[PDB]
């Protein structure tokens, strides 16, 4: 196992890779810390689809924002330069309220 002092050039983390909330915005964080200013990409699968928005900020992240509209096992596909990341895929288990 790794430590916090030796992490990779580009990472994806947060509760939005592993859980969800139907009809309220689901989010997680990505960080191109030695990879660059950005340029990575995503795709999301499941029983249903999402809009996969993002925000630039001033903190160096590529902050991802999506919206699950039906309860399900929403599979994140992270890619870095045309191929998948070292920990891909991920699966956001979205729970419902109605």
From Swiss-Prot:
Domain of life: Eukaryota
UniProt PTM: Phosphorylation extent changes in response to cell activation.
Organs and tissues of expression: Ubiquitous.
Per-repeat ranges for Filamin: 5-92
Protein's cellular compartments: Cytoplasm, Cell cortex; Cytoplasm, Cytoskeleton; Perikaryon; Cell projection, Growth cone
Subunit-structure text: Homodimer. Interacts with PDLIM2. Interacts with RFLNA and RFLNB. Interacts with FCGR1A, FLNB, FURIN, HSPB7, INPPL1, KCND2, MYOT, MYOZ1, ARHGAP24, PSEN1, PSEN2 and ECSCR. Also interacts with various other binding partners in addition to filamentous actin. Interacts (via N-terminus) with MIS18BP1 (via N-terminus). Interacts (via N-terminus) with TAF1B. Interacts with TMEM67 (via C-terminus) and MKS1. Interacts (via actin-binding domain) with MICALL2 (via CH domain). Interacts (via filamin repeat 5) with SYK; docks SYK to the plasma membrane.
Disease as annotated in the protein's UniProt record: Periventricular nodular heterotopia 1: A developmental disorder characterized by the presence of periventricular nodules of cerebral gray matter, resulting from a failure of neurons to migrate normally from the lateral ventricular proliferative zone, where they are formed, to the cerebral cortex. PVNH1 is an X-linked dominant form. Heterozygous females have normal intelligence but suffer from seizures and various manifestations outside the central nervous system, especially related to the vascular system. Hemizygous affected males die in the prenatal or perinatal period. Otopalatodigital syndrome 1: X-linked dominant multiple congenital anomalies disease mainly characterized by a generalized skeletal dysplasia, mild intellectual disability, hearing loss, cleft palate, and typical facial anomalies. OPD1 belongs to a group of X-linked skeletal dysplasias known as oto-palato-digital syndrome spectrum disorders that also include OPD2, Melnick-Needles syndrome (MNS), and frontometaphyseal dysplasia (FMD). Remodeling of the cytoskeleton is central to the modulation of cell shape and migration.
Entry note about domains: Comprised of a NH2-terminal actin-binding domain, 24 immunoglobulin-like internally homologous repeats and two hinge regions. Repeat 24 and the second hinge domain are important for dimer formation. Filamin repeat 20 interacts with filamin repeat 21 masking the ligand binding site on filamin repeat 21, resulting in an autoinhibited conformation. The autoinhibition can be relieved by ligands like ITGB7 or FBLIM1. Filamin repeats 19 and 21 can simultaneously engage ligands.
Protein purpose: Promotes orthogonal branching of actin filaments and links actin filaments to membrane glycoproteins. Anchors various transmembrane proteins to the actin cytoskeleton and serves as a scaffold for a wide range of cytoplasmic signaling proteins. Interaction with FLNB may allow neuroblast migration from the ventricular zone into the cortical plate. Tethers cell surface-localized furin, modulates its rate of internalization and directs its intracellular trafficking. Involved in ciliogenesis.
Family statement drawn from the similarity comment of this UniProt entry: Belongs to the filamin family.
Listed name of the protein: Filamin-A
